[PDB]
């Protein structure tokens, strides 16, 4: 597990997530893969130091975990990237999930009375439509996040 946030890492998101995809295949369920980029860590790190940036990451991680199911997967994909696997999702409920996830990551983190906030950008991929494996789905979600901010 990621030492800073305690969340599963990139390696673990795959080991876990690939099994969920195999389960969804058997159960005839859909799985939604969210790629979350957080903007604003460069400014926090440059101004206050990497340790304040790490406190922001830790609080944001805890907040997201508390707002998704314990059966869903939240991983620290990279430095300022998070990946979320939502098991047994449907298109009709997506808008509500995105609003909940965006509002949670957008909440300021009070670090010694300074109000530090990051800006989330989310890309979505859907299993089985967007791919057979988690590597494929993540690339689709990542590219969608990239193309929307252009
Ligand atoms: N994997 C995953 N799927 C999610 C998650 N959030 C919502 N869904 C999916 O979206 C459906 C509708 O969500 P809702 O509008 O919040 O509508 C929900 C909500 O109002 C309530 N609900 C169910 N569980 C919880 C919960 O643990 N906490 C809260 N506050 N409400 C819950 O019951 C309604 C119906 O729930 P469901 O039949 O299960 O139907 C849920 C479920 O299939 C999620 O965090 N992870
Ligand atoms: N709007 C909405 N939010 C959802 C949904 N599913 C999960 N969440 C969010 O994710 C948090 C953690 O879900 P959990 O791990 O299943 O942890 C849940 C779950 O174990 C249980 N719980 C609450 N409501 C339901 C429910 O309606 N059905 C079942 N089976 N369990 C529930 O209590 C724990 C804490 O619930 P919360 O405090 O509500 O905290 C929930 C809620 O903020 C949902 O379908 N709709």
Author numbering: 90 to 239
Question: Could you give the paper's own sentences about this structure?
Answer:
We report the structure of tDGC from Thermotoga maritima, an important enzyme for the large scale enzymatic synthesis of c-di-GMP and the first GGDEF domain from a hyperthermophile. We expressed and crystallized a domain of the TM1788 protein from Thermotoga maritima (248 residues, WP_010865403) spanning residues 82–248, hereafter named tDGC. Cellular levels of c-di-GMP are tightly regulated by the opposing activities of diguanylate cyclases (DGCs) that synthesize c-di-GMP from two GTP molecules and phosphodiesterases (PDEs) that hydrolyze c-di-GMP into 5′-phosphoguanylyl- (3′-5′) - guanosine (pGpG) and GMP. C-di-GMP synthesis from two separate GTP molecules requires dimerization of two active GGDEF domains, with the loops bearing the GGDEF motifs of each monomer brought in close proximity to initiate the cyclization reaction.
In order to understand the structural determinants of tDGC thermostability and to investigate the catalytic mechanism and feedback inhibition of this biotechnologically important enzyme, we crystallized tDGC (i) in an active-like conformation with two A-sites in proximity, and (ii) in an inactive conformation, with c-di-GMP bound to the I-site. A comparison between these two structures enables us to examine potential conformational changes propagated between the I- and A- site upon c-diGMP binding to the I-site. In conclusion, our study identified a dimeric active-like conformation for a thermostable GGDEF domain, where the relative orientation of both active sites is compatible with c-di-GMP formation. Using the tDGC active-like dimer as a guide, we were also able to propose a 2-fold symmetrical dimer conducive to GTP cyclization with a nucleophilic attack by the 3′ oxygen groups of the ribose. Further structural and enzymatic studies are now needed to confirm this model. To investigate if c-di-GMP binding at the I-site causes conformational changes at the A-site, the structures of the active-like and inactive dimer were compared. The backbone and side-chain conformations are closely similar, suggesting the absence of signal propagation between the A- and I-sites, upon c-di-GMP binding.
